[PDB]
From a paper:
Here we characterize a metal-dependent, bifunctional [name] from the leaf beetle [name] by structural and functional analyses. [name] in [name] (PcIDS1, EC 2.5.1.1) produces FPP in the presence of [name]+, but preferably forms [name] when exposed to the heavy metal ions (HMIs) Co2+ or Mn2+. Inter- and intramolecular cooperative effects in the homodimer strongly depend on the provided metal ions and regulate the biosynthetic flux of terpene precursors to either biological defence or physiological development. Strikingly, a unique chain length determination domain adapts to form geranyl or farnesyl pyrophosphate by altering enzyme symmetry and ligand affinity between both subunits.
To elucidate the structural features of FPP formation in the closed state, we applied IPP together with a geranyl pyrophosphate derivative brominated at position C3 (3-Br-[name]). In this surrogate, the electrophilic bromine prevents carbocation formation and blocks catalysis.
Residue numbers in the entry:
A (entry chain A): 87 to 107, 111 to 328, 331 to 427
B (entry chain B): 86 to 184, 202 to 328, 334 to 426
Write the structure that this text describes.
Amino acid sequence: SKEESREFMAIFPDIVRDLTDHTDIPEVTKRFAKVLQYNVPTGKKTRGLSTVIAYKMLEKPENLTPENVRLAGILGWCVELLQASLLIMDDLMDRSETRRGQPCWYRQENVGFLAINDCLHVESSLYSVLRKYFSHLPCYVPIIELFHDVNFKTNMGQSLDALCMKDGRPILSQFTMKRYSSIVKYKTSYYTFQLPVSLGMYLADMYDPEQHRQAKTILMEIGEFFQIQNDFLDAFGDSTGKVGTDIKEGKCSWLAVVALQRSNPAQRQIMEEHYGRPEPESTQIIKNLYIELGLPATFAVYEEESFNIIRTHIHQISKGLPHDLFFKIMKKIYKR
Amino acid sequence: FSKEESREFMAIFPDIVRDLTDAGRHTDIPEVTKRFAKVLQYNVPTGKKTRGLSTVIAYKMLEKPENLTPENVRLAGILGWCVELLQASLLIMDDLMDRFLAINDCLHVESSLYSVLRKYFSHLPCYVPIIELFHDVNFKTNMGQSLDALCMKDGRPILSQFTMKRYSSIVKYKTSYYTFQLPVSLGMYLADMYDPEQHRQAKTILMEIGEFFQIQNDFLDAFGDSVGTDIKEGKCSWLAVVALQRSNPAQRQIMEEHYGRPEPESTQIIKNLYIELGLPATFAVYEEESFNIIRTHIHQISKGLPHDLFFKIMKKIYK
Ligand SMILES: CC(C)=CCC/C(Br)=C/COP(=O)(O)OP(=O)(O)O
Ligand SMILES: [Mg+2]
Ligand SMILES: [Mg+2]
Ligand SMILES: [Mg+2]
Ligand SMILES: [Mg+2]
Ligand SMILES: [Mg+2]
């Protein structure tokens, strides 16, 4: 919706003012405004907007006031602040050139490893936003605890991802489907899928842990498909205006994991020799192996089977959770 | 810090590691959880733990003697370890900018203190004041780190930025809030002391003590008996700030040419300039005058706050 998008985007400048406008240190508050402006509001705010839509589908219709929808928007921006902090740090760790076509924050003049402090600063800032707008509401402490717990879990995911590499070289013995599933769950699914929905639930005063658990079961399955589709399109997508670098980066990708499952010893040796190498010819060799191993056909089967399995699980959801929310998430990911 | 206080405090650490690395819960990610145990063990419990123990001593000197149970003194110890988790995250961030530590270990160790707070304090009246204090001190400490960084550009110190106003702000935000205010305000909250005027009264004195602590530290970096790298690193130190205040144009030119250079000869040139500028005598005057002002302010402490706590902190720094 155009109206939902514009109402959401209009909140961002107020949050920057809340975090910057400490009158004894104006130079560093002006700098922090630039950190937020560069890293937080550009490109798609899918997670932030999903927080608002989750709330709108969980709350009683008569309680959906402009005031409460704006509170859902502020929680959405707190998700975007967490994500901005994570991506500032990840770009430094991976020594990436760009994100969404923008030069990475750490590459800007006189940032570099100061990006680590900026990461911690941006993550810390969301709790000041929560205090300003939520400190008098019953959802305050549950929402604080959710953000701190998702941060902790996301760090476990990032560190597990790092345990698949040694001295900038992929450890292919670590590239198992069990490890892949765990990386996706902790590194991406918690902050991308669980956090927006659990925030919507708390703002709607839904505190039943069993409701959050039932939601989690579905959201982790959808999150797994989301990342697998993302991994698939990195190699096999139409260059969306993005050029995929997962192979060059030596990522523990669904493609790399399934390639190792399906590979004979000779095919395994091609992965060992060429995976995670900077040479364009090495990326071409890996892509050619993925084609040879029939990974496109394997993804097509997984895409249809996973859709049916998740649809079945959503029909089985109970304890008064709305099915339409989970069907709508399923539709926007699978695009059907 | 007494033998009993120190030993009881240090005995809590292994429980905090078990709490954070899912001991009792049967985790689906045991290899990264085992790694996080090693991150905590290798970086958090080593050295003196002054901030952690200061949290326990603050609580013991603020609480009613009747309420000082083993259980409550242990809770003060857990709050002290949350301060030491913050300290460890800041030291890791320092080590990462210097050089098995991963970049996200500083974020992860910082985040872990909030898991400890939730575990032990979520059902107590002091919970929200304590988490809001950590949120605020976290944000202010990051502001302080960035203010320090604004004194350097393209690997060179920006000496025009080296003002006493900027120096005082760096020390307050980067160091004094988490080192001095945080332990005492935590002790006060655990003792159910919520009065904003009491917290403000403590803050005035603790920011003054924090400033002396850092100025003494800066002085000893150049003039202590060993090795200090503040000059080589181009740090906005009290010595550099006062050197610029006291320098004639020729002396300023020596700072401009030799401050923040890697050559050992350039460090010796700056130390020789500090000597001819009378920074030792200037420090001696500052130390006596600051001691007298802080002693006066502690004697004047009101709002029902105990003097002995602030005198114990003061005497620990001034020796
Ligand atoms: C704790 C912490 C800093 C987590 C980062 C989480 C995320 Br989301 C990292 C991004 O994942 P990845 O580097 O695999 O892909 P890309 O950079 O989007 O191409
Ligand atoms: Mg990356
Ligand atoms: Mg990464
Ligand atoms: Mg991708
Ligand atoms: Mg990328
Ligand atoms: Mg020093």
